[model samples]
Target: MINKDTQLCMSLSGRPSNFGTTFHNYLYDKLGLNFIYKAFTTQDIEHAIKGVRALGIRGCAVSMPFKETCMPFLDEIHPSAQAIESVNTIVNDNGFLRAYNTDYIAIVKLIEKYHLNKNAKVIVHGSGGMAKAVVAAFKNSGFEKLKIYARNVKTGQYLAALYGYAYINSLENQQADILVNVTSIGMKGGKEEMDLAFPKAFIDNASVAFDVVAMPVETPFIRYAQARGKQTISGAAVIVLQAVEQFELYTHQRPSDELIAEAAAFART
Candidate 1:
């Protein structure tokens, strides 16, 4: 299958991940596509973009520190990235680089997929880049009465005010119909692996829980929500949805939903 004509798709993140590589490659193999996927990191993003243009890399997934910094180097910005000034996907069409934010798009799709209430009071925990995507997704989906919780007062208030959501310093006695954890509080191999991002009372009051930590899938937060009989969304779904978007962007084909389920299971393993 190795050939000079094989197309290539790559990911450039501050910290690399095997998730996207697995997700895209599996689909390519199943579909018998002449494509390969790889992951890389760079100290010089400008030259990296230059290399992408020069080498004719078909697609590049951008993440972390490069999300905002890679903007000026891009030839075009989609409205998804333009709204948040962050990019997660870049498709190079014969040296013309187009940037997008599938993270926001994926989140928007999830809201509709889960039939989440636009009128539901919500609390999102985090003030990072991913948090911006989550907040913007909910905001644009007509969600109001949202609160943002973070230990960092400056960034928390900044993100909340940016979207007209309340910034919370403490979780004491907080209640909402939906609770989302965008932090690494329950991340695998982290110090907070056993911690639940929301309080017991908050979990009790909420009908849905969303955790952004993809590895291991069953974070303490997800388990807690599950035990309480609340609907739960895992980070696994988020990553898969975003990767599928990238795959479609690169290949211009939509894999069946059943195939996507199999690909996601293959990716998680």
Candidate 2:
């Protein structure tokens, strides 16, 4: 259904992600914007970004595995992307690609919206690009007692040290007031889709549980927290907020609240 009149945007991910297309296309069709979004995976990250610059792609959403890897390819990095060392959005203007990280912005907004305890002992799972965004968001939000757990010692310790948080190799007997999962453990369609990011004991003890797996609003980790009556934040919230920012960047228009709500509902459907 595409034509020369269509404006093209896209996302690059290691695996399939429906978030960008779901949110972007919903708003595009609803608002009558001419933008069309597509998703792709690449065998070569450099060539993929080069293609973005060469092909006149309007916008590009960068997902896991490539978030950090795509940094050097961009012409400029916005402060948001530089702060977290991750790039989740790329806007191409006249063949120059500028990178941004709306993931941090989304997390920061959620922390404020929920009024999460600033003094709470927080534990973040994962050491990848998204983990950098989550940790940076919390650190900048005044969460002091933070710990990072990752199987990779180097990356885990590096991220932890970057924010002055403790690094742990395992979650054994670890307890925190707030638990955030930025890893792919409970993500839909992954081998670990049914897995909980942390043990039941850890989840049951936390006051807040947040998962960044947006495909299913109710991830196994979120469900475990719900069963224990913990206040929860779904990845769907982050997905929508971040996508909203991306939409604004692409179209230079801030969607009305009513329109955003309708787009979110459509994305969930």
Candidate 3:
């Protein structure tokens, strides 16, 4: 159904999947937006970004391995993207390319949606792009006693210092009111997809749990949390909310919540 009038958008990742296309195309079809979304992988990210500007690609969703790396090539960086040093979304307007991080916004919205305690003790696992966004969101929300559990001493300690939070190498008998998993441990096709980021007791003890592994929706961590009767937030919600934001940014149209719910159902199936 693609025609010369249809605008083009895409996502760049180390391993591109159909998640973005399914979510985006369904909305395009239902809302009658003249847009098309595709997923891609590139050996040369710099060249890929150049193409975005030169060829006038509307927007792009940047995934891991490229989120942080793509920042240097962007002509402008929004506050959210610059705050975490991550770029999960980029918009091109008449060759003027600007980068943004809707992941931060997504996390922020989810926290409010779930009504998480602002004063709760929070533990975040991971120190990469998504981790930065997660931590930044929580910190900005004024969550007290926030700590990061990352094995990489350098990156972990740096993120902790940057955000004024403590860092730990292990969970052991530690507990928190909320646990956030930003690692790929429970992601589909990941080496540790079936592994829990923290001990089962951690989820069993926490009041709320979040897993940022979107593909499977029900990650091992999330299942364990649910079994413990703890409130859970899936990466699926994060994916949808962030993509909804990206869609508005790209087409200058805001989709109603009912439309978003329908699009989310399409992504799930």
TM-scores, each model vs. reference: 0.96, 0.84, 0.89
lDDT of 1 at 246: 91
Of 2 and 3, the candidate ranking higher by TM-score: 3
Tens-place lDDT digits, model 2, residues 26-142: 888878788899899998999999999898888999887898899999999998898887799999999989998998888998999999989899999999747888999999999
Q: How would you encode candidate 1's per-residue C-alpha lDDT over 60-82 as one tens digit per residue?
A: 99987799888889999998998
Model 3 scores worst on lDDT over the 10 consecutive residues at 196-205
Error of 1 at 143 (Å): 0.5
Candidate number with the higher lDDT (1 or 3): 1
- Report lDDT per candidate: 0.91, 0.88, 0.89
Model 1: ten consecutive residues of lowest lDDT: 212-221
Model number with the top TM-score: 1
Q: Candidate 3, 163: how far from true, in Å?
A: 0.8
